[PDB]
Amino acid sequence: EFQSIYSLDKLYPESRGSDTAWRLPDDAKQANDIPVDRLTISYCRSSGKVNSKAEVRFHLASADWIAEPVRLKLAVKHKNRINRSGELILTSECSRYQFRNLADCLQKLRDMIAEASQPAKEPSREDAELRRSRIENMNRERLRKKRISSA
Amino acid sequence: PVENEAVAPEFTNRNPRNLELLA
Amino acid sequence: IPRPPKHEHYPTPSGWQPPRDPAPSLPYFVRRSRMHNIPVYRDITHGNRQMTVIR
Amino acid sequence: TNLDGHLLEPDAEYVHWLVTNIPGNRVTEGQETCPYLPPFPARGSGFHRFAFLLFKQDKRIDFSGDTRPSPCYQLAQRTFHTFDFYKKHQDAMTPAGLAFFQCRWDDSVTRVFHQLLDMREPVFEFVRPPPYHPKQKRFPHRQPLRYLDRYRDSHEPTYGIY
Amino acid sequence: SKNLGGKSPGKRFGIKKMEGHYVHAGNILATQRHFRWHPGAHVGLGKNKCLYALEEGVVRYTKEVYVPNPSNSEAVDLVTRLPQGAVLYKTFVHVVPAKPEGTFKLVAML
Amino acid sequence: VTYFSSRKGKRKTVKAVIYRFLRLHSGLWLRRKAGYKKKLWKKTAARKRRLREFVFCNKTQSKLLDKMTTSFWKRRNWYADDPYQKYQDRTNLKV
Amino acid sequence: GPRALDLLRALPRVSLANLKPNPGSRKPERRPRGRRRGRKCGRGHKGERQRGTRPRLGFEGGQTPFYLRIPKYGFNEGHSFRHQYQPLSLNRLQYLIDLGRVDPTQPIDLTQLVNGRGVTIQPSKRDYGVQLVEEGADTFKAKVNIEVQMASELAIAAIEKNGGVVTTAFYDPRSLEILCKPVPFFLRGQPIPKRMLPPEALVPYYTDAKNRGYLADPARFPEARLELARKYGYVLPDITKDELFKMLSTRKDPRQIFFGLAPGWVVNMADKKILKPTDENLLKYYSS
Amino acid sequence: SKTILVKMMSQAGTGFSFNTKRSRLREKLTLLHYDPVVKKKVLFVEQKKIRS
RNA sequence: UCGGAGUACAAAAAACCCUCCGAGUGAUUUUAAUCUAGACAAACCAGUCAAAAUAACCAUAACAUCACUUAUUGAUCCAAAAU
Ligand SMILES: [Mg+2]
Ligand SMILES: [Mg+2]
Ligand SMILES: [Mg+2]
Ligand SMILES: [Mg+2]
Ligand SMILES: [Mg+2]
Ligand SMILES: [Mg+2]
Ligand SMILES: [Mg+2]
Ligand SMILES: [Mg+2]
Ligand SMILES: [Mg+2]
Ligand SMILES: [Mg+2]
Ligand SMILES: [Mg+2]
Ligand SMILES: [Mg+2]
Ligand SMILES: [Mg+2]
């Protein structure tokens, strides 16, 4: 009941009620991205280094909270981390806290979604470890260039 | 389980050129 | 020191667990601490002698 | 023969294509003992070796223990030992042809693992031994401040009793 | 009196790891003032002619032929003045690696 | 060192030790290499880096500095954004 | 059980004539008397050691001392003015709640923590209160209205997951001593003073909604809570429609030290009464 | 043959000076050095004379 | 005070008001960075090497070189610069 000059009500007259800080602005965020309830999250606390493996699995085909071109782009690009059952799997091992591990998993998911959503992706490639691959492919098709009908 | 599912996690590659080609 | 509150599920989220209502039939009893913890401690001497003390 | 790529036995090898009793050059006319299986090197361990061994034989060798079934999609059944094979049939065949190529993982190996072999694709990696550090000293003399970081389990702050 | 400055501590210029010793990467195998031991396989040479192991392994000492750098004018002159049947020999220190480069470990079945 | 002060009768500490030394709660003492600001134009880059690096003290010097300092400097400090809070404790010391 | 009690029946009376300390408890003193401990009495031959005229500790016999040839560098420079915060693990808080040291049904304060002996604050040693760390955030399953001075981002996330309230406030040393030991202050016989505002170095910390500052804009609290929940992948509990919403939303005035009490009041504990000033100047000073 | 000690300041904008020895009978020195602030080869010119 | 050779013949160390050379820097441009394993030497203070990783030059070096190259050097504190 005590009120002073520096009280919150006098400092910010716009919000005077004691329940103004506990509201839920559902109108500000209506997209509701990353429905964590639709992601399968599993924890494995390996101790002996002490770290919490966090695995986030979700069916890429059945994930209807992103667009069809986005789903196709994730399927094309991240097929190396897609299970035989179609479940995209995200791995976190950095921090000892499952909270931070899940945060890392969600950040990776958001980054992949944004990368597949943006159409200005120029597909820039590294050169330090790609020159060897380019030379090897060059020399391999140098032998493949034989032109004789078969089959 | 699947009879072929066995992995033997200690995988040994006896190819003498394997590491040379992997650089 | 207040007596610990009764919980509907054990062990507690902090790992604390109260003793059994009937005492075991063993010919010895390890009385709990004043904070209701097991009197098992670690001790160090000379900087390299490591010991465990049951009180 | 797939020399390197057997998941279980380091000293064993896989079969991929065994054709026997080839009349002269027409290999398609000769009977095939083992149906062809495309190479399936693991994703991690790369650059496996596949060898084509050609044997010239005098007699018409006929066998039943080395014959494989029509599907022949079992890795347990596709386990081979060229030394044992040549010991069994050493009297007739003599090796005269050789053709071997290196092969690494690509985007079709996962399809081969899934559709044909009916398993989960195994993934390996080239791990390295952990860096060596001497026994930690109670008083590290003239050592940098980062000396304590060489023996830290994790870069997180642990509060034991607080 | 007439002679001054003759006092100076020894520099400990000598051999640190003998043959058969198990060394780790970076260990100083031997230090020297002039070229007495030459580095060989997996042994690097510092700016002060010291020899340090580059890989973890076992130290060995061998006697081997000496082919100098063609840009080294003094050594090239010595070689060109050597007689027909003469081949230079030097004592080289080697490190024979013990541990393998790495291992292929299974991480996950996808 | 004044083992018994004339006013309070307590034990005093020399201020030079605390002005040019830092003690971690694990017992280690941290110091700066001598001559790290002198004639830098005359020294090689490796030597300058070695001088810039922080270094520890051995058992004799640590015990000497513990004798010179009092118990106020061996206490556990929880500073706000302490650079050495991670180094305050010792881990995986098998003795 | 105690068979020693039955053994004592056969033994004679326990009196002052038969008392012995534990063996090894008192090491016997040794004097410089006799053949072995005489003849220089453990002091050595001539020099400064036998005559007791040794130099000080740091002296090395005229060589420049080790503790003086090292350059001065700022290591403890300004140590007596750095802010110190006693850490309180979420694991320790859960342990206290489970053992009943602190009741989650009431707003948890520094006074409550001190009474429950969970933390020890020494304001004379430049402690500025209690900070919250995340050392036990994985197994924290309590809904409390915590009130600390500093809070970790992960600790805040862990508490909001269960549905508590985290508020970071500032306490000047005088009010901090009063909060830590209220009964001695009430026996001191002085009116409750006002709570000093944080300095310019700590105003940004306590006026941001990301740190749940007590001087922060309450309108930005839901936005920060939603951002935290989205970052850490948990649903934000419906705190407003909780049964204990009053206890969760109770707050202290930025010039208020205790709950309910106001600056300028005198707590007469002998008569169990409160004296409130009524002078206009006194009221203006205490409410300003 | 007395030398001189000269402090050179970078011309890359950032304040970065290094000391180098130079002969007294030489003109104002100007070289190419490495500036850690910008991590590039930058022209350095003699700004001050410190030691003889 | 510092370095080289003999004393001190073959890992290291090793003294004399012992026998001899030297140093208290010059010339030139390639103006020679950060971070970090592991080591030499060492009472301490100091002195030495150095793999991997980083930004700029060949997209293949950077340890500045030579003068027997080894010595060409001075701790805190305190004073000055522009930090
Ligand atoms: Mg003890
Ligand atoms: Mg000599
Ligand atoms: Mg000497
Ligand atoms: Mg005695
Ligand atoms: Mg006595
Ligand atoms: Mg005696
Ligand atoms: Mg006598
Ligand atoms: Mg004497
Ligand atoms: Mg006498
Ligand atoms: Mg003197
Ligand atoms: Mg304290
Ligand atoms: Mg040694
Ligand atoms: Mg390198």
CSV table of C-alpha atoms in Angstrom, one decimal, chain A residues 45-134:
chain,number,residue,atom,x,y,z
A,45,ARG,CA,22.7,-37.8,-19.6
A,46,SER,CA,26.2,-39.3,-20.3
A,47,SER,CA,28.5,-39.0,-17.3
A,48,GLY,CA,31.8,-40.5,-16.4
A,49,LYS,CA,32.7,-36.1,-19.7
A,50,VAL,CA,29.4,-35.1,-18.1
A,51,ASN,CA,27.0,-33.9,-20.8
A,52,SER,CA,23.4,-34.1,-21.8
A,53,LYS,CA,22.9,-35.4,-25.4
A,54,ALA,CA,19.6,-33.8,-26.6
A,55,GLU,CA,17.9,-35.3,-29.7
A,56,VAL,CA,15.0,-33.6,-31.5
A,57,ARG,CA,13.2,-35.8,-34.0
A,58,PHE,CA,10.3,-34.8,-36.1
A,59,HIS,CA,8.7,-36.2,-39.3
A,60,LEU,CA,9.7,-33.8,-42.1
A,61,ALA,CA,6.9,-35.0,-44.4
A,62,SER,CA,4.2,-34.6,-41.7
A,63,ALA,CA,5.5,-31.2,-40.5
A,64,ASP,CA,2.7,-29.0,-41.7
A,65,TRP,CA,3.8,-25.8,-40.0
A,66,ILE,CA,6.2,-24.9,-42.9
A,67,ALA,CA,5.5,-24.5,-46.6
A,68,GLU,CA,5.9,-27.2,-49.3
A,69,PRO,CA,8.9,-25.6,-51.0
A,70,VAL,CA,10.6,-25.2,-47.6
A,71,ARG,CA,9.9,-28.9,-46.9
A,72,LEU,CA,11.4,-29.8,-50.3
A,73,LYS,CA,14.5,-27.7,-49.6
A,74,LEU,CA,15.1,-29.3,-46.2
A,75,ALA,CA,14.6,-32.7,-47.8
A,76,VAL,CA,17.1,-32.0,-50.5
A,77,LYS,CA,19.8,-30.3,-48.4
A,78,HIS,CA,19.6,-32.0,-45.0
A,79,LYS,CA,19.1,-35.6,-46.4
A,80,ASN,CA,22.4,-36.5,-44.7
A,81,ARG,CA,20.7,-36.1,-41.3
A,82,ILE,CA,17.3,-37.6,-42.2
A,83,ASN,CA,16.4,-41.0,-40.8
A,84,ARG,CA,15.2,-43.9,-43.0
A,85,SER,CA,11.7,-43.3,-41.5
A,86,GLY,CA,11.7,-39.7,-42.7
A,87,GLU,CA,12.3,-38.2,-39.2
A,88,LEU,CA,14.7,-35.3,-39.3
A,89,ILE,CA,17.0,-35.5,-36.3
A,90,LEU,CA,18.8,-32.6,-34.6
A,91,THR,CA,21.7,-33.2,-32.2
A,92,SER,CA,23.0,-31.1,-29.3
A,93,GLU,CA,26.0,-32.0,-27.1
A,94,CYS,CA,27.6,-28.7,-26.2
A,95,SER,CA,26.3,-27.7,-22.8
A,96,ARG,CA,25.7,-29.7,-19.7
A,97,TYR,CA,22.2,-28.3,-19.3
A,98,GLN,CA,19.3,-29.9,-21.2
A,99,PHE,CA,17.8,-26.4,-21.4
A,100,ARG,CA,20.8,-25.0,-23.3
A,101,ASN,CA,20.9,-28.2,-25.4
A,102,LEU,CA,17.3,-27.8,-26.5
A,103,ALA,CA,17.9,-24.1,-27.2
A,104,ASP,CA,20.8,-25.1,-29.5
A,105,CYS,CA,18.5,-27.7,-31.2
A,106,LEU,CA,15.8,-25.1,-31.7
A,107,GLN,CA,18.3,-22.5,-33.0
A,108,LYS,CA,19.6,-25.0,-35.6
A,109,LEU,CA,16.0,-25.8,-36.6
A,110,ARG,CA,15.2,-22.1,-37.0
A,111,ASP,CA,18.4,-21.5,-39.0
A,112,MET,CA,17.5,-24.3,-41.4
A,113,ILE,CA,14.0,-23.1,-41.8
A,114,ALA,CA,15.2,-19.5,-42.5
A,115,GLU,CA,17.8,-20.8,-44.9
A,116,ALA,CA,15.3,-22.8,-46.9
A,117,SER,CA,12.7,-20.0,-46.8
A,118,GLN,CA,15.0,-17.2,-48.1
A,119,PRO,CA,15.1,-17.2,-51.9
A,120,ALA,CA,18.3,-15.2,-52.2
A,121,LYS,CA,20.5,-18.1,-51.3
A,122,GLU,CA,23.4,-18.0,-53.7
A,123,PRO,CA,24.7,-21.4,-52.6
A,124,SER,CA,28.2,-20.2,-51.9
A,125,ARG,CA,30.8,-22.9,-51.6
A,126,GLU,CA,34.1,-23.1,-49.7
A,127,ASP,CA,37.4,-23.5,-51.6
A,128,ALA,CA,39.9,-24.8,-49.1
A,129,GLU,CA,38.6,-28.4,-49.2
A,130,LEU,CA,36.8,-28.2,-52.6
A,131,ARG,CA,39.8,-27.8,-54.9
A,132,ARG,CA,40.8,-31.4,-54.3
A,133,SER,CA,37.3,-32.6,-55.1
A,134,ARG,CA,37.2,-30.5,-58.3
